[model samples]
Target: CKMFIGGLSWQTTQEGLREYFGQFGEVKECLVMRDPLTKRSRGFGFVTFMDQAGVDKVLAQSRHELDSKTIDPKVAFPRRAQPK
Candidate 1:
C-alpha cells in the first residue's frame, strides 16, 4: 500500500523525501502537492514503494518527540478539521 504522508515542512522536497525514505526501500515515486499559481508546498504528499515492508518501517515511528513538527504518516486517511 502507498503511504499517505503529511505535516511536512515547507522546505521538504521530493528529493529530500526520496533520500530520506530511500533507506527503507527504493522510493518508487515521490509526489508533493503544489499550488497552481504560487507553487508553494501544500504540506502533503504521497510515496509509493517497491516493498510493503518498507512502508511498514516508516510507519512505526511515534514522533514520538524532538523535531516532530512534521512527519505524519499512515496507510489510509489523514486527520481532517472538524466540519462546521
Candidate 2:
C-alpha cells in the first residue's frame, strides 16, 4: 500500500516521516521529497506499507501533522505500465 504526502514543511525528512508513521504499524518505505538541482525539500513525498491495514489507517486518519504544519495525505496508485 502506498500514499502521497502533501503540504509538507521544508523541515520534514524521510527519517522523520518514517518515525511518525511507524506508530501506526510497520512502514515498509517512506520518503520526504527533495528538489533535484538544489537538493532541497519539494514539500511532498510518498510512503509505502507492507500491509494494507496500515494504508487504510492513514486514509482513515484525516490529516498528518509534522514540522508545525498540517500534512495532506492521499492514496497513491502504483505507476502504470506501458503497453508493449
Candidate 3:
C-alpha cells in the first residue's frame, strides 16, 4: 500500500529518505514534491515500497522518532489520483 508522508522539513531530500527507509528494506520509490520555482519541499510526499510488509515496518518503527524541532512527520493512507 502507498503511504502519504507529511510534515517533511524543507531540507528533506530524496537521499535522506533513501537512507532512512533503506534500513527496513528496499525502497521502491521516495518522492518529495517540490515547488516549480523555489524548489522547496511542499511538506509532503509519497513513499512506495515493494511490499506491504515494508510499509508496515516503517509505520511501526519510525513514525514518531523522525520529527525535528522545525517539522513533524506523519504517515497516512495515500490519496487516490484523480481521473484524467
**Stretches > 4 Å off in candidate 2:** 80-84
In model 1, the runs with Cα more than 4 Å from the true position are 64-68, 76-84
Residue lDDT tens for model 3, 1-84: 666667777777767766666776787878888887997888766677777777777667644323372333345554666687
Residue range 1-84, candidate 1, lDDT tens digits: 577778876666678778677877898778678676876668777777888988888877665111244577778454443676
Candidate 2, 26-70: lDDT as tens digits: 888887779867767788898888898988888888668988889
| Per-candidate RMSD, Å | 7.2, 3.4, 3.5
Q: Which order, best to worst by lDDT?
A: 2, 1, 3
Model 1 TM: 0.75
True-vs-predicted CA distance for residue 20, candidate 2, Å: 0.9
lDDT of 2 at 34: 94
Best by lDDT: 2
For candidate 1, the per-residue lDDT at 35 reads 74
- For candidate 2, the C-alpha RMSD (Å) to the true structure equals 3.4
- lDDT of all the models against the reference? 0.71, 0.83, 0.66
Query: Ten consecutive residues with minimal summed lDDT in candidate 3?
Result: 64-73
Which rank order by TM-score, best down to worst?
2, 1, 3
Overall local distance difference test of candidate 1: 0.71
lDDT of candidate 2 at residue 73, scale 0 to 100:
78
Q: What TM-score, over all chains together, does every model reach?
A: 0.75, 0.84, 0.70
